[PDB]
Structures are given as structure tokens and as C-alpha cells.
Amino acid sequence: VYKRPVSILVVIYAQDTKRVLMLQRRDDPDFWQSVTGSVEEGETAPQAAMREVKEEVTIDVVAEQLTLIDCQRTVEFEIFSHLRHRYAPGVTRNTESWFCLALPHERQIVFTEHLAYKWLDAPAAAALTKSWSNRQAIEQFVIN
């Protein structure tokens, strides 16, 4: 069914090294990203952020007593041409809200939506992703 054009982004990084967890998409294997996901009907952006973090990298933020920071930033961007097919007819814009998740250390990731994961220094991660909003969020909330 159609993806929804309201989404979240969670920049996951490790507090000690400042390396950024990057995940390799399966629909576009050249697309490495932080965690993104559609906000579903009747759920809030923070709810979606926590749900997608649990789904995509098997990190439970409530149980692990971690802190999902609302970055208080929302941007809108054009859906990539070759991925637009997954949205309702005529949907071309996506509105995305930003979140931060600092883990104490780099760790092993069990992932489900992706092909592979890498821990990268924040400029490398920012330079790797194809999404300008993901790049901006790493620059603004990891690098400072």
C-alpha cells in the first residue's frame, strides 16, 4: 500500500566516538541513510520514530531507557524520481521531522529493512548519504 508523505528521520550516533550509524537501502542499494520511516495514521512523529527505530535496528528505546531527542526541525523535499512509485498518485513532496538518538557506544546492529550497516565519522556519513535532509541533520546535530 502507498507510503505516506509524512515521515521521520532519526540520526543514530554513538556518544563516545561521534560515529554515525548508516544503513544501506534495499530498494536503492546506493542509498545509505539514518533511520527514516513513514508516520502512520493516528500515530505521532515521536511514536513513529520509536517504532521505526525498534523495527529497523532492533533498538528498544523505552526498555533500554534511552533518550530520543526531538530536534524540533521539519523540512519538506522532493521524493526521488525512481522511488515516487510507492506514493499515492500525484504525491511528490515528503515532509520529514528530525530526531536524535545518542547511544553510549558503537554497537552491533540487527537490521531488517536494509542490506548492511556501517559506523562512519559524521562528515563521512554526511558525505555518503544521497538525501540532503539526512546530510543536513548529521551536520547540525552530530558535528555541531
Nearest to 134 by CA among 90, 91, 94: 94
The three-state secondary structure class of 100 is strand
**Cell numbers describing residue 142:** 552530530
Residues that bind Ni ion (CB under 5 A): 36-38, 52, 56, 104, 113
Closer by beta carbon to Ni ion, 31 or else 141 = 31
Identify residue 36 by its one-letter amino acid code: T
Report in angstroms how near the CB of residue 104 gets to Ni ion at its nearest: 5
DSSP state of 15: T
**Cell numbers describing residue 123:** 562528515
Closer by beta carbon to Ni ion, 17 or else 92 = 17
Closer by beta carbon to Ni ion, 106 or else 121 = 106
Closer by beta carbon to Ni ion, 29 or else 104 = 104
Residues that constitute the known binding site for Mg(2+):
52, 56, 113
Return the ∠ at Cα 93 (arms to 90 and 97), rounded to 5°: 145
Report in angstroms how near the CB of residue 143 gets to Ni ion at its nearest: 23
Report in angstroms how near the CB of residue 23 gets to Ni ion at its nearest: 8
**How far is 102 from 128, CA to CA, in rounded Å?**
20
Residues that constitute the known binding site for substrate:
3, 25, 36, 77-80, 131
Residues that constitute the known binding site:
3, 25, 36, 52, 56, 77-80, 113, 131
Report in angstroms how near the CB of residue 72 gets to Ni ion at its nearest: 21
Q: Are 40 and 52 in contact (CB under 8 A)?
A: no
